[PDB]
Every structure is written in structure tokens, then in C-alpha cells.
Amino acid sequence: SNQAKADAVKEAFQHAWNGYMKYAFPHDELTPVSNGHADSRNGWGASAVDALSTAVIMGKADVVNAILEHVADIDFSKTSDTVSLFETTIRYLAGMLSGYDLLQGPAKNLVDNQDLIDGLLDQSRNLADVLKFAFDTPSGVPYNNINITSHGNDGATTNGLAVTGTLVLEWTRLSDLTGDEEYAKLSQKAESYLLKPQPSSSEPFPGLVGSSININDGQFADSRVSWNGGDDSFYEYLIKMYVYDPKRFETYKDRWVLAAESTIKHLKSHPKSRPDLTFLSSYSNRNYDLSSQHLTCFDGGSFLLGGTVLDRQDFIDFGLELVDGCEATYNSTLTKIGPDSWGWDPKKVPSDQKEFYEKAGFYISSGSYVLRPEVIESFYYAHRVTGKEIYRDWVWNAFVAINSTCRTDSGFAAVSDVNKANGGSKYDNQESFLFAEVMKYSYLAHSEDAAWQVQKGGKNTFVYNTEAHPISVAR
Numbered sequence: 315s316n317q318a319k320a321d322a323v324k325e326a327f328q329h330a331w332n333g334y335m336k337y338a339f340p341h342d343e344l345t346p347v348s349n350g351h352a353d354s355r356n357g358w359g360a361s362a363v364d365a366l367s368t369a370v371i372m373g374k375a376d377v378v379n380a381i382l383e384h385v386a387d388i389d390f391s392k393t394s395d396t397v398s399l400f401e402t403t404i405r406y407l408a409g410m411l412s413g414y415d416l417l418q419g420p421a422k423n424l425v426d427n428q429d430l431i432d433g434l435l436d437q438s439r440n441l442a443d444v445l446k447f448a449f450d451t452p453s454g455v456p457y458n459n460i461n462i463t464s465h466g467n468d469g470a471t472t473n474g475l476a477v478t479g480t481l482v483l484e485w486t487r488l489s490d491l492t493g494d495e496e497y498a499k500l501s502q503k504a505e506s507y508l509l510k511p512q513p514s515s516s517e518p519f520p521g522l523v524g525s526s527i528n529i530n531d532g533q534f535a536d537s538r539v540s541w542n543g544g545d546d547s548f549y550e551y552l553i554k555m556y557v558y559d560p561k562r563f564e565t566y567k568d569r570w571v572l573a574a575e576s577t578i579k580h581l582k583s584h585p586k587s588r589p590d591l592t593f594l595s596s597y598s599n600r601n602y603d604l605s606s607q608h609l610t611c612f613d614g615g616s617f618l619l620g621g622t623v624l625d626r627q628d629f630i631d632f633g634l635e636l637v638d639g640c641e642a643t644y645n646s647t648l649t650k651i652g653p654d655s656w657g658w659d660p661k662k663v664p665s666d667q668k669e670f671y672e673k674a675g676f677y678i679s680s681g682s683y684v685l686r687p688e689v690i691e692s693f694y695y696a697h698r699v700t701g702k703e704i705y706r707d708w709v710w711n712a713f714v715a716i717n718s719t720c721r722t723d724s725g726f727a728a729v730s731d732v733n734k735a736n737g738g739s740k741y742d743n744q745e746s747f748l749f750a751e752v753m754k755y756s757y758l759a760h761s762e763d764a765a766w767q768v769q770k771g772g773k774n775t776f777v778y779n780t781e782a783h784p785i786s787v788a789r
């Protein structure tokens with residue numbers, strides 16, 4: 315049963331890895347339709363690094379070794395493209411760090427070369443060292459788009475909420491492993507402004523804050539509240555930091571609780587045609603935006619994690635409703651894969667989708683699917699927290715649908731319309747998170763228990779970064 319399913323996920327992973335190694339390694343990614351290569355992540359081989367933690371958990375030594383050898387020859391000081399502090403941190407930094415914690419712990423007997431493993435920490439340090447000037451601003455809030463050769467930047471005046479609040483986990487982990495407090499201090503100082511929002515008008519409801527921060531003074535520049543892309547990650551890390559070290563980050567938890575409760579009381583939303591479904595809305599100045607994104611579906615998992623860690627049945631109950639809502643967007647389409655964005659505002663239902671809306675509870679704004687893992691991510695937590703088999707089945711149903719409609723001879727491709735036969739047309743694109751997240755969460759849902767699995771209560775010894783890279787907790 316599960317064993318056969320777990321092995322099936324490993325085959326899908328091996329499939330994409332073979333195509334990637336065959337046509338793109340060591341470039342950042344494989345172009346699944348033309349069987350070529352692209353470098354959307356500065357060219358240090360993003361798909362290889364992102365795949366590391368997944369390969370280690372799957373016990374594929376050949377894959378791990380090939381990746382470790384490539385990590386040793388990477389020169390993080392050279393790139394012809396501007397670098398995103400956020401993307402580089404959640405994929406590359408967390409990817410090598412995760413590999414290190416896993417191979418140094420639960421997977422200690424998977425590889426021989428101890429030097430290639432230690433190299434993961436060394437290179438993580440070198441990467442942080444080349445990027446840290448980003449934090450050298452008046453407030454401490456970094457510039458996200460930088461030029462590492464000429465320490466210049468975007469010229470931007472503000473930094474986004476998620477790009478600012480989704481760095482603390484991996485930069486603090488680096489400090490804890492190296493003994494050098496500089497990394498923790500830089501990221502945490504940046505995070506401090508998010509924990510004590512100013513002006514007060516930028517925090518419409520307790521715990522819910524604006525979407526952008528002034529780099530000059532660290533004050534919020536707007537009052538738009540949301541869990542969508544650009545905001546999401548901030549809230550996710552609030553509770554995850556508490557799991558990492560409850561003694562050091564109790565304040566992060568308190569802040570997440572406020573956010574969680576205010577979200578339940580104010581952002582909770584039900585479609586007119588389907589009062590039984592629950593999605594989250596966005597809030598600006600007393601006005602509500604009745605639309606969401608696939609990205610936002612990470613929300614169910616957040617409520618479930620905090621729910622089990624804090625023993626709050628109400629957060630668990632609400633997380634399950636969010637999970638049900640996201641599952642609804644998946645099983646209502648022709649391909650059984652959910653849309654990238656949707657709405658449920660009765661006043662804006664497109665004429666050509668009127669009847670779909672009336673029965674499904676929403677209309678599709680963008681029917682593309684770019685191999686995102688957020689829905690499967692939350693299904694995974696729902697299964698770990700409740701132990702109910704139905705959530706594992708939903709993970710499998712989604713995985714089979716992805717395998718059946720996105721698979722190409724070399725890997726998996728993004729799709730243009732999840733509500734058309736065979737997904738419409740395929741995009742010549744395969745993001746790094748296919749390896750890091752879609753394949754890992756799908757496998758974990760059917761694989762055996764182990765330290766790296768999400769646990770209930772206070773038993774977690776690993777915590778997942780936003781790119782699904784398992785980081786060992788402090789102490």
C-alpha cells in the first residue's frame with residue numbers, strides 16, 4: 315500500500331533527476347519541454363541544491379554524492395545576475411544547511427566523504443558572507459535585490475513583508491552552527507521591526523500587519539493585510555521559530571497567536587454559493603478582497619502546526635477548514651489540480667464561469683499550475699496532526715494528477731489551464747521546488763516515521779523552512 319506509493323514517488327523524483335542530469339546539470343534548472351537548461355537562480359545549480367534534502371530523505375546516495383561534489387566547486391561570489399536575498403536564502407542557504415543537519419544526524423550512514431558534508435557548512439558561511447552587506451542599511455531592514463559584485467542595489471525604498479520576515483530561520487541556524495552570532499543578529503534585527511509594528515495604523519487588527527517596510531526607518535509603508543504571496547512566509551516563520559527554540563523565541567509565538575486569532579475572526583470568508591467552504595480574504599482599509607492564491611494554501615499547515623504545538627484545538631479545527639477549502643479547488647477542476655488564483659466575490663463572477671461558480675464555490679482567475687507544493691504541504695500536516703487516512707489519500711490523488719498531466723520525457727512541466735484536457739499547454743519550465751517540495755511532501759506522506767517527519771505536540775526535532783528543507787531544532 316503505502317510502501318508501493320512511496321516507491322512510486324521515488325520513481326517520479328528519479329525521473330526528473332535523470333532528465334535534469336541529462337540535459338541541464340549543473341545549470342539552475344531543466345527546461346522540460348525543449349530539454350534544455352535555464353539559470354533563473356544566479357547559476358549556482360538551484361535544482362541540485364534544492365533536491366539535496368529530498369534525495370537524502372529518500373536514501374538515494376548516488377544523487378546525494380553528485381550534489382555534494384557540485385556544492386564543493388560552487389563559487390558563490392560570481393554571478394552575472396542580480397541576487398534576491400530571499401530566494402537565495404530559502405533555497406541555497408537552507409538547502410545546504412538542511413543537508414548538513416540531516417547527514418550529521420538521522421542520515422549519518424548515507425555518505426562516506428565527511429569532507430563533502432562539512433563543506434556544506436563552510437559554503438553556507440561563504441554564501442552568507444557574500445550576502446550580508448544587504449543588511450547594512452539605516453534600519454537594518456535589508457535590500458532584497460542586490461548586486462554582489464558592486465555592493466549596489468535596486469534603489470528600492472521599501473522591502474516586502476515576506477522577503478523581510480522569511481530569513482530569520484536559516485540565518486539564525488547558521489549562527490548556532492558556526493558560533494558566529496553575526497548572522498542571527500542581522501536577521502533578527504530586521505525581524506524586530508515586524509514584531510513591534512509602527513505606525514499602529516499599519517496593524518489593522520492585533521498581529522496582522524502591512525505588506526511593505528521602509529528601509530530607512532523600519533516603519534510600515536502600508537496597511538494592506540494578507541496571507542497571499544508577498545506576505546505569507548512572514549506568518550509561517552513566526553510559529554516555526556518558536557518550534558526551533560521555544561526558550562529564545564517565545565515572543566515570536568505570542569505574535570503568531572495574535573495573528574492566528576485575528577485571522578480567524580476577520581479574514582475568514584465563505585463563498586455565497588458554498589457557505590460550507592472557507593478561504594481567507596485580504597484586508598486593506600475596512601474593505602475586503604475576496605480572492606486567494608495557491609500560495610496562500612500553506613495557511614492550513616501553519617494553523618495545524620501551531621495548533622498541535624500549542625495544543626489549541628481551535629487552531630487545528632480552523633486549519634482543517636482551510637485544508638478542505640484548498641482541496642476543493644483541486645478536486646473541482648478537470649485535471650484535479652487546483653488553479654494558481656481564484657475569487658468568490660458574487661459581484662465579479664465571470665459570465666462564462668457562472669455555473670462553475672454556483673457549484674464549485676469560486677471562479678478561476680488564473681488556471682495555470684506551476685508545480686507549486688502548498689496544497690500538498692498542508693495535506694501532509696493534516697495527516698501528521700490528525701492521523702486520518704483521508705488527508706494522505708488527497709496527497710496521493712494530487713500526486714497522481716500531477717504525474718499524469720505534467721510529466722514529460724525529461725521531467726515535469728508547468729501547465730497553462732488546470733480546467734482543460736491535459737492541462738491545456740505545457741510551459742517550458744520546471745522550478746527548483748519540484749525537487750525540494752512537491753516530491754518531498756508527497757513521499758513523506760507515505761513513507762515511514764522518522765525524526766524528519768512532522769510530529770505532534772512538542773516532539774518535533776526538525777522544523778521545515780519555507781522551501782521544505784528540514785532544519786534541526788536548537789540545542
Ligand SMILES: *[C@@H]1O[C@H](CO)[C@@H](O[C@H]2O[C@H](CO)[C@@H](O[C@@H]3O[C@H](CO[C@H]4O[C@H](CO)[C@@H](O)[C@H](O)[C@@H]4O)[C@@H](O)[C@H](O[C@H]4O[C@H](CO)[C@@H](O)[C@H](O)[C@@H]4O)[C@@H]3O)[C@H](O)[C@H]2NC(C)=O)[C@H](O)[C@H]1NC(C)=O
Pocket residue numbers: 590591631634637638639641642645700702704
Ligand atoms: C473534494 O473536496 C471537498 C471539500 O474539501 C471534500 O469534502 C469534504 O471534505 C472533508 C472530508 O473528510 C469533510 O470534513 C469532515 O466533515 C465532517 C462532516 O461535516 C459536517 O458536519 C459538521 C458538524 O460537525 C458541520 O460543521 C459541517 O458543516 C458538515 O455539515 C466532519 O464530521 C469531519 O470532522 C471530523 O474529522 C476531523 C478530522 O478529519 C476532526 O478534526 C473532527 O473533530 C471530526 O472528528 C470533517 O470536518 C468536509 O466537511 C467535506 N467538505 C464539503 C464542503 O463537502 C471532498 O471529500 C473531496 N472529494 C473527493 C472525492 O476527494
Ligand SMILES: *[C@@H]1O[C@H](CO)[C@@H](O[C@H]2O[C@H](CO)[C@@H](O)[C@H](O)[C@H]2NC(C)=O)[C@H](O)[C@H]1NC(C)=O
Pocket residue numbers: 394395396461462463464466
Ligand atoms: C553589478 O555591478 C557591476 C559593477 O562592478 C557591473 O559590472 C559591469 O558593469 C558594466 C555593465 O555593462 C560593464 O562595465 C561590465 O559589464 C561590468 N564591469 C564591471 C564594473 O565589472 C554588473 O553589470 C552589475 N550586475 C548586473 C548585471 O546588474
Ligand SMILES: *[C@@H]1O[C@H](CO)[C@@H](O[C@H]2O[C@H](CO)[C@@H](O)[C@H](O)[C@H]2NC(C)=O)[C@H](O)[C@H]1NC(C)=O
Pocket residue numbers: 322714717718721
Ligand atoms: C506516473 O507516470 C509514469 C509514466 O506515465 C507511470 O509509469 C509508467 O511507466 C511505463 C511508461 O512510462 C509503463 O510501465 C506504464 O505506462 C507506467 N508504469 C506502470 C504502472 O506500468 C507511473 O506509473 C505514474 N505514477 C503513478 C503511480 O501513477
Ligand SMILES: [Ca+2]
Pocket residue numbers: 612779780781782
Ligand atoms: Ca513555502
